[PDB]
Design a protein around this ligand. Sequence first.
Ligand SMILES: OC[C@H]1N[C@H](CO)[C@@H](O[C@H]2O[C@H](CO)[C@@H](O)[C@H](O)[C@H]2O)[C@@H]1O
Ligand SMILES: OC[C@H]1N[C@H](CO)[C@@H](O[C@H]2O[C@H](CO)[C@@H](O)[C@H](O)[C@H]2O)[C@@H]1O
Lengths: 649, 649
Amino acid sequence: PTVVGRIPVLDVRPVVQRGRRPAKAVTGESFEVSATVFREGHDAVGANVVLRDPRGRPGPWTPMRELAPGTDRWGATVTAGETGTWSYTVEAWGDPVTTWRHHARIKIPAGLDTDLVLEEGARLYERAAADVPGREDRRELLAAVDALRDESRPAASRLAAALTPQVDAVLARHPLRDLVTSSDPLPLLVERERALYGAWYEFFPRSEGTPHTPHGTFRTAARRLPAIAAMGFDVVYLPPIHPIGTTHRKGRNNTLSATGDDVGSPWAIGSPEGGHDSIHPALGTLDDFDHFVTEAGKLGLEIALDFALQCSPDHPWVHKHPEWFHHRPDGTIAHAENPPKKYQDIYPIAFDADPDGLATETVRILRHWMDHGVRIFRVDNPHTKPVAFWERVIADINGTDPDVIFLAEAFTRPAMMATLAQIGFQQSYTYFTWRNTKQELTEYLTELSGEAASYMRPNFFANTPDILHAYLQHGGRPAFEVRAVLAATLSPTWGIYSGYELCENTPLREGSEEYLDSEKYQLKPRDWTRAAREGTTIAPLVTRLNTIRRENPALRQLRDLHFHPTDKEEVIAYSKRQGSNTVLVVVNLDPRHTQEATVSLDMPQLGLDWHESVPVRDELTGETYHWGRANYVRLEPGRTPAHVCTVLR
Amino acid sequence: PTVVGRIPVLDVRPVVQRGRRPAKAVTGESFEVSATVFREGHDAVGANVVLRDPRGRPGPWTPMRELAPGTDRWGATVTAGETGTWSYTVEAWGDPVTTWRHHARIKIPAGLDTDLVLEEGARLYERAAADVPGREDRRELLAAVDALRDESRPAASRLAAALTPQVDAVLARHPLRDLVTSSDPLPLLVERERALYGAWYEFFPRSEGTPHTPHGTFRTAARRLPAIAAMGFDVVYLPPIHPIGTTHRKGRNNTLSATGDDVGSPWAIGSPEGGHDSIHPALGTLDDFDHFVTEAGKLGLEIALDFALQCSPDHPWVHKHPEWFHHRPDGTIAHAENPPKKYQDIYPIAFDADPDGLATETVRILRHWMDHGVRIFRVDNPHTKPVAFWERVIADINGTDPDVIFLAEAFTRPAMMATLAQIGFQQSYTYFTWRNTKQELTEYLTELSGEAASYMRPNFFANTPDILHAYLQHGGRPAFEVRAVLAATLSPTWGIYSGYELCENTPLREGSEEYLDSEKYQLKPRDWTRAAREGTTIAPLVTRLNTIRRENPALRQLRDLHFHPTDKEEVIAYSKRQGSNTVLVVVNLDPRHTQEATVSLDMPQLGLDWHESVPVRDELTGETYHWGRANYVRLEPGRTPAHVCTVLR
Ligand SMILES: OC[C@H]1N[C@H](CO)[C@@H](O[C@H]2O[C@H](CO)[C@@H](O)[C@H](O)[C@H]2O)[C@@H]1O
Ligand SMILES: OC[C@H]1N[C@H](CO)[C@@H](O[C@H]2O[C@H](CO)[C@@H](O)[C@H](O)[C@H]2O)[C@@H]1O
C-alpha cells in the first residue's frame, strides 16, 4: 500500500505535533483548514474539507480553493460547533467538468470537433446527474445533457445550455468528483466559548476589608464583585485562598523576614490550619467561599483560582509526604527559585519519587474546588513542574469535566510555552507586557494570530502583581489607556490586575517591574469611591472596551486580524473581522506626545474596493467618520488613546 | 500514557511526510539530526542521537549541543554507513553533573554551606562511577569522590579535585544521564554513492554511426565511450533505445510529417518490431547491447536508460491493451501534450482502468533491462503519470534491487517535484538551467542544500536536448565554461548532453530553448577527432572538473555549501567542505567582460578566524595563492572563467 493516494493530498494543517495532539477551537470559532493538493497531468483538481463532529456526523459541503496561483496550496474555512473531540479530513479529486468547460469554451467557438466535444460534455453531465440525490436537480442536468446532444441546434447554443446559472448551481453543490482521495483524519478539540473569549479581573480578597477588620473576608470582598461586573468582566481570578505559612514568611516589599502582623505571600501555601483544600482562616470558611462564588455567579462572573503546586515549610505535606520533596544530605529542603527571583518562603515539589501520589492528590484538590463551583484554574509557574504531569492532570480532569479551563502562567522560553499549550492548557499567558512598540506588537500578534492560534489561546493581562512594565511607569495614565485598548482589542481574552484602573505605577525601584509596597506582601485598601467621584479611574474606558467587545463578534475571536500600514512609527492600525462585523482600531503608542498620521487601509482585506469610502463609528466617543484608502488621524494622549471603530452598514 | 515524556523531546528532524517516508542519505554522507529538547525547572539537559543500522546496531556515542542560545534546538552530525533502512532516535536527559558543577563553582567561593554542596557532589560522582565500565576511569571518579569528602582539606581544593581534566574526560565519555527519554524512531534510507554523486553524459547512439552506415549501432556507439570515460563521466544516459513508431512520426526540426528516411523521435516508442522491452532494429540486437554495456563497464561507466511510459500509435499495447489508453467517443486516442508542447507522435497512458496490469508490465520491463546490467533509469515526465504509480513501481523494484537508481525528469511545479523525490525517486532534475544570475544561483542552491537535501538529490544537467538556455545562446564558449564549472562544483551530480562540449548554441529560433536541427529528430554526426584537433571543444575543461571532483570529497556531497560575499554582482563565490577537504570556488558569471572583484570570505565558515591567511591552489591552472578575508580576483572570459581552489595543507 502507498503513502500517497490517487490524487495527492499532503500536509493538512492545522496540525499539532504531527497529529498526536489536537488542534484547538471553541464553539462558533472559524479557522482555515489547508492542504497541498495536485494531480498528475494538466487537468483540474478540486478539494473539500470534511469536518466531523464527536458522533462522526459530517458538516456541510465545504469546497476549498487554491490560496495563491501556482502554489497547489488549497484552503477553506470551517466552523466549530458543539464542544468535544472532532476530526477533519481533506478530500481531493479530479475535476473533469471544470477541465471540460475550459476546453469546450475554446474549441466550440473555433469550430473544432464540436460534436465530439459536446458529446464528451453530455457524458460528463450524465455521470454528474447519477450522483445527484434531488430529483429536480438531476432533471436540471439531464435537460442540459439533452440540449448538449441536440444536433439540430447550433453548437454554441448547445454549449451555452451546459453553462447556465441553474446548471452551475447544481454542480456547485454536487460536483462530479473523479478519483476522490482522502487525507487521514486529524483531531480537533472544541472547547467552550470562555476558553477563547473573556475579560479577566484579578484582585486580593484580603485587601477588601473594613476599618475594624483590615483583613478582608469572602463576605466583605464580595462587595467588589458588582463593580467588577459593572466594568464588563467575566472572570475573577483570585490569588491563592489557602492558609499561609509562618516559617520564613516574607515581609513587606519582598523582605526576607516578616514582622508582627505581616500577612505574607498567598503563594506560600500551607500551615497547620490546612493546605490546598482549605481556606485561609482570615478569609472565612468554605461556606463563605460558596457565598462568594454564588454572588459572583449571579453577576455573570466565574471564579478562577490560583493553583500553585508548591508548599510553605509549614504545609502538612512536608511531614505527611516527605518523598514529595528533594532532601539534601542533612535532610533539609532547599527553597524554590525562579532565577534571579528567590522564593525563600517556599519548597518546590519533587516529582520523581511518587509521581502517582502527587497526580492523585492534585486532581483530588482540583475536583474539590470544582465541587464548589470553580471551573477555571490559573496554574502558577507550570514550567517548574514536569510537562507530562500537567498533560496527565489536565487529561484526568477534562476527561470527566471538559468544561474546566486551565490557564498557564509560563513566562519562559518559547518551546516550553508552546508545549504546555499543546499538551492541554486551554490558555496561556504571553509576552504581551513586553511588546510595546509597533514592531513588537505587530510581529508578536502576527505569531499569536497565525499558526500558534492552532494550539494556543492568549490571555492578555496588561498588568499582573509581578509585572508593572516600564511603559506604564513612564507613561502614566495615557499609557494605561493605550494598553487596555491594545489588550482588549488584540486578544479575545484580556485582563487587568486591580489598581490598573487607578493607574498605579510606582515601581519598587528604577529598573524593576515590581510594584512598590506590593499587594503580594501587604493589605492594600483602595479608595474606589473617591477615584470614581474625582474621575481618576479609567474604569469607564475599561467598561466601554468590554461593552464594545460584547457587541462586536470580531473582537471575540483571534485568528482574523490584519495590520494596516501607517506613516508614523508611533501609530499602529489593525482590523478584525467576524462575518459582517468589522472592527478597525487605530492606536497612538506614544503616551507623551500628540501624533498625527495617515492610515492607509488595505481595503480588499476589509472586503472593499480601493476607491471606496466607508462609514465608521468611533465606539469610544460616538463620533462618526467616513474612512477610505487614506485616512487622517490625530491622537492626543490624555484626550484620546485610540479610535475603536465599527464599520457601519 | 502521555504523548510527552519525562524530558521533552519534540520535533525531531529531518522528517519527511511526518515520518511516513524515509529521509535519505548515501553511504558516507553526513547530515544533522536535530530536536527540541528542554526540561522543567532550571537544571541542565543533555541529548544524544542514536542512529541504528539495518540490524538495529547503534552507532557511537553522539552527544548533541544547543545550536543557538535560548532556542532549545539541539543537533549533532551523524554519518550514514552501509546501504539499507536505518532509524534514528533522539535521547534527552537531565545532566545533573553540569548542574551541580555550575552551582558548586558559585557556592564554594561564597562559603555557603560548602560541606553540604560537596557532599551532594560526592553522591553524584558515586552515581556517575557506578555506570562507568573502565577499571581505571571508575577509580578516577571514586578518587574525586574521596577528595570531595575530605573534610580536612580546604573547600576549594576539595572542589577542584572534582574538576580536573582527567575527571572531565571520563564524564565526557560516560556522562551521568537522568530520566532518559527517547523520541520515536524515524526512518532513514541509505543508498549507494552514485545516488548522490556522479557525472552524467547523455548521447544518442544512433548519431555515432559511420560514413558507410550513418545510423549508429550499439557496436559503433561503444567506440564513443572511451572519450566519454576520458572526460571523467560515470554514467551514460541513453534516450529510448526501442523501435520507433512510423504513424505520425515527426520530421526534422519537430515537423509534423516525417519524410523519406527521417528517423523520428526515440521517445515515440513501439512498432510491430517491438516495444519497451525491445531494441531498435537499426541499433542492433540484445547481444550488441550487452557488448555495449560490457564496454561501458570496462571504462567505469554505468548505463542509464530512458524510461518513457508512453506509446507510438504503432506500439503493440495499443491494440493488445486498449484499456491502457483513454479513448474519445469516436474511439480515437488523443495525442500527448506538455502545454504548449505537443507530442503528435505518441499516446499517453491511462492508468485507472488496469493499474495493476500497468504496474506489473512496467516492473517486468525494468527488470528485463536490469538483467542486462542497467541499474539506473532516467524516468521521462513522471509527472504526467500518477504519483502513486511511481511510488509502487520504485518500491517494487527497490524491494528486490535496492541499488537501482531512478532519476525524475520532472520540470514542473515545486509540490510535484518535491513529492516525487519523497515517494522514492533517488534523483531529480532541477531548475538549474533557469538559474543563471548570482541571486538565482544563491537562492536556488540554498534551497537544494538545505531541508530539501533530506529527500531530494539534484542532478544538474547544464543542457538537455530540450533545453538550450539563452545564457548559452548569447554567451558562446565562455558561457559553456561557466555553467560547466557551476554545475560541476555546486552539485555532487551533474551532467551534459553531447555537443555541450562543442558549444553548440544555435537555437531553433530566437526566444526558443530548442536546438536548431535537434538530435531528437535527426542523426547528428559530430567530428570528434577534428574538434579535439582544432581545440574547439571544452572537453579538457570538463575533464579537469571531473578530476577535481574525484580528488576532493568536498565536491562529492551536497549539504555543506556556503556562499561568500563579493563586491561585484557578476562574481559569485562559495565554499564546500567535507572533513579536512575544503574547496573554494569563484565564478565570473559574465561571459563577455573581464570582472574584477573582492571576495570577502566568511573565515569562520572555513574554520579559520578572520585574520588568518591560507594557501590555495586553483586546480584549473595550478596557480597557488594566499587568500584571507579579502581577496582580489580578476576573471577573464575565455581565459579564466573561474577559480576552483583547494585549501592547501
Ligand atoms: O505568577 C507569579 C507568581 N508565582 C510566583 C511563585 O509562586 C509568585 O511569587 C510570589 O509568591 C512567592 C512565594 O509565596 C514569593 O516568594 C514571591 O516573592 C512572590 O512574588 C508570583 O506572584
Ligand atoms: O525529457 C523530455 C522529453 N520528454 C518528452 C516526452 O517524451 C520528449 O519529447 C520528445 O519526444 C516526443 C515524442 O517522441 C516528441 O513529440 C517531442 O517533440 C520530443 O521533443 C522530450 O525529449
